[PDB]
Design an enzyme around this catalytic site. Sequence first.
Site, mmCIF file in Angstrom:
data_model
loop_
_atom_site.group_PDB
_atom_site.id
_atom_site.type_symbol
_atom_site.label_atom_id
_atom_site.label_comp_id
_atom_site.label_asym_id
_atom_site.label_seq_id
_atom_site.Cartn_x
_atom_site.Cartn_y
_atom_site.Cartn_z
ATOM 1 N N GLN A 1 29.150 -16.096 -48.894
ATOM 2 C CA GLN A 1 28.114 -16.295 -47.851
ATOM 3 C C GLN A 1 26.916 -15.417 -48.203
ATOM 4 O OE1 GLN A 1 31.408 -17.422 -44.572
ATOM 5 N NE2 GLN A 1 29.396 -16.966 -43.688
ATOM 6 N N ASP B 1 20.489 -24.196 -60.682
ATOM 7 C CA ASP B 1 21.026 -25.149 -61.684
ATOM 8 C C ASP B 1 20.316 -24.899 -63.026
ATOM 9 O OD1 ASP B 1 22.019 -27.239 -63.215
ATOM 10 O OD2 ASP B 1 21.474 -28.810 -61.739
ATOM 11 N N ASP B 2 21.028 -24.369 -64.032
ATOM 12 C CA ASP B 2 20.361 -24.042 -65.314
ATOM 13 C C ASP B 2 20.323 -25.251 -66.258
ATOM 14 O OD1 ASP B 2 18.775 -22.227 -66.841
ATOM 15 O OD2 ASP B 2 20.561 -21.134 -67.576
ATOM 16 N N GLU C 1 18.314 -27.351 -65.239
ATOM 17 C CA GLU C 1 16.850 -27.498 -64.970
ATOM 18 C C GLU C 1 16.074 -26.609 -65.939
ATOM 19 O OE1 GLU C 1 16.488 -29.924 -63.210
ATOM 20 O OE2 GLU C 1 18.348 -29.970 -61.946
ATOM 21 N N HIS D 1 12.743 -20.919 -50.871
ATOM 22 C CA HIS D 1 13.511 -21.907 -50.051
ATOM 23 C C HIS D 1 14.989 -21.480 -49.908
ATOM 24 C CE1 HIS D 1 14.632 -25.973 -48.514
ATOM 25 N NE2 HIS D 1 15.787 -25.689 -49.148
ATOM 26 N N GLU D 2 15.657 -21.164 -51.015
ATOM 27 C CA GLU D 2 17.110 -20.831 -51.018
ATOM 28 C C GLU D 2 17.363 -19.523 -50.249
ATOM 29 O OE1 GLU D 2 19.241 -23.074 -51.725
ATOM 30 O OE2 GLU D 2 17.805 -24.440 -52.817
ATOM 31 N N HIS E 1 17.846 -20.071 -46.516
ATOM 32 C CA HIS E 1 19.256 -20.390 -46.188
ATOM 33 C C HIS E 1 20.088 -19.096 -46.150
ATOM 34 C CE1 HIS E 1 18.756 -24.685 -46.423
ATOM 35 N NE2 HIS E 1 18.500 -24.685 -47.763
ATOM 36 N N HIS F 1 17.443 -26.774 -42.937
ATOM 37 C CA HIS F 1 16.325 -27.640 -43.355
ATOM 38 C C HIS F 1 15.391 -27.941 -42.182
ATOM 39 C CE1 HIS F 1 18.556 -28.776 -47.265
ATOM 40 N NE2 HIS F 1 17.680 -27.789 -47.460
HETATM 41 C C1 LIG Z 1 25.804 -26.244 -50.655
HETATM 42 C C2 LIG Z 1 26.534 -25.151 -49.871
HETATM 43 C C3 LIG Z 1 26.763 -25.567 -48.554
HETATM 44 C C4 LIG Z 1 27.763 -26.574 -48.358
HETATM 45 C C5 LIG Z 1 27.997 -27.036 -47.011
HETATM 46 C C6 LIG Z 1 27.191 -26.449 -45.971
HETATM 47 C C7 LIG Z 1 26.201 -25.506 -46.180
HETATM 48 C C8 LIG Z 1 25.339 -24.785 -45.430
HETATM 49 C C9 LIG Z 1 25.223 -24.844 -44.051
HETATM 50 O O1 LIG Z 1 26.223 -25.197 -43.392
HETATM 51 N N1 LIG Z 1 24.086 -24.462 -43.385
HETATM 52 C C10 LIG Z 1 22.749 -24.040 -43.985
HETATM 53 C C11 LIG Z 1 22.525 -22.587 -43.559
HETATM 54 C C12 LIG Z 1 22.771 -22.471 -42.139
HETATM 55 O O2 LIG Z 1 22.335 -21.521 -41.286
HETATM 56 C C13 LIG Z 1 22.846 -21.850 -39.990
HETATM 57 N N2 LIG Z 1 23.545 -22.960 -40.125
HETATM 58 C C14 LIG Z 1 23.512 -23.351 -41.400
HETATM 59 C C15 LIG Z 1 24.157 -24.443 -41.877
HETATM 60 N N3 LIG Z 1 24.625 -23.883 -46.221
HETATM 61 N N4 LIG Z 1 24.993 -24.031 -47.455
HETATM 62 C C16 LIG Z 1 26.017 -25.021 -47.490
HETATM 63 CA CA LIG Z 2 17.689 -24.144 -67.934
HETATM 64 CA CA LIG Z 3 27.328 -12.567 -50.471
HETATM 65 CA CA LIG Z 4 20.238 -30.681 -61.254
HETATM 66 ZN ZN LIG Z 5 17.715 -26.230 -48.818
#
Ligand SMILES: CCc1cccc2c(C(=O)N3CCc4ocnc4C3)[nH]nc12
Ligand SMILES: [Ca+2]
Ligand SMILES: [Ca+2]
Ligand SMILES: [Ca+2]
Ligand SMILES: [Zn+2]
Length: 231
Positions: A161, A167-168, A170, A188-189, A192, A198
Amino acid sequence: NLTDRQLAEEYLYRYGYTRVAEMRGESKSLGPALLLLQKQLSLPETGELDSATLKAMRTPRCGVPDLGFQTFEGDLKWHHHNITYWIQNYSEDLPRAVIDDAFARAFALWSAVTPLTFTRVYSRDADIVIQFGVAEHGDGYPFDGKDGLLAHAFPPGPGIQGDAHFDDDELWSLGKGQGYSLFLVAAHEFGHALGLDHSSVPEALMYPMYRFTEGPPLHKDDVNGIRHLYG
Ligand SMILES: CCc1cccc2c(C(=O)N3CCc4ocnc4C3)[nH]nc12
Ligand SMILES: [Ca+2]
Ligand SMILES: [Ca+2]
Ligand SMILES: [Ca+2]
Ligand SMILES: [Zn+2]
Ligand SMILES: [Zn+2]
């Protein structure tokens, strides 16, 4: 080399639309799932595999699902102020100092608008572990080779978490000439990794599709999202 129809079925499955259509008794045909995707991406709501929808589906994007079966531990926000990060490994596409600076600039964007601080460490127990990986890279959410999904990240909490993976298969650059901006995709990442989902606003950093810009990347929607998480 899937047909357009096959790409659409795979996109709707991967990002969570087919599962929501199943929960509404409407997974027999494509139309209901297409309407869910059009609402979620702010496209015209036709319920058809039209030009706007196929162009959206062919656009490079984040590998995190849009709607959604992955259970995580805790309430998905950090409960301490000093968030640490470790750069575990490096893409050979850029110099190490340019990679380090791209991530530091992505954290600086969030630092100004949140009560959190971001400090670089050299330790496996950092909150945010950063990794470059290809195909199956140790977490059972495999990457997909060149283009398609660029990267993914996990919401706040223990172990995996909070981590961010790139993704390399790319080409990583600063988004000028050839390649994807590591700075924009990291920003962006890291959203999260702070607990944001999103956005449906196409101009917002947290919109799922990759958009290159030379302007300041944060929009009102992103700043308000963070505000509604951290007092
Ligand atoms: C790709 C990794 C992944 C797989 C399934 C669910 C994912 C989530 C996800 O559940 N969320 C994106 C981050 C977040 O903050 C509050 N709720 C959420 C929900 N984040 N990365 C995830
Ligand atoms: Ca690369
Ligand atoms: Ca961690
Ligand atoms: Ca890719
Ligand atoms: Zn995203
Ligand atoms: Zn991963």
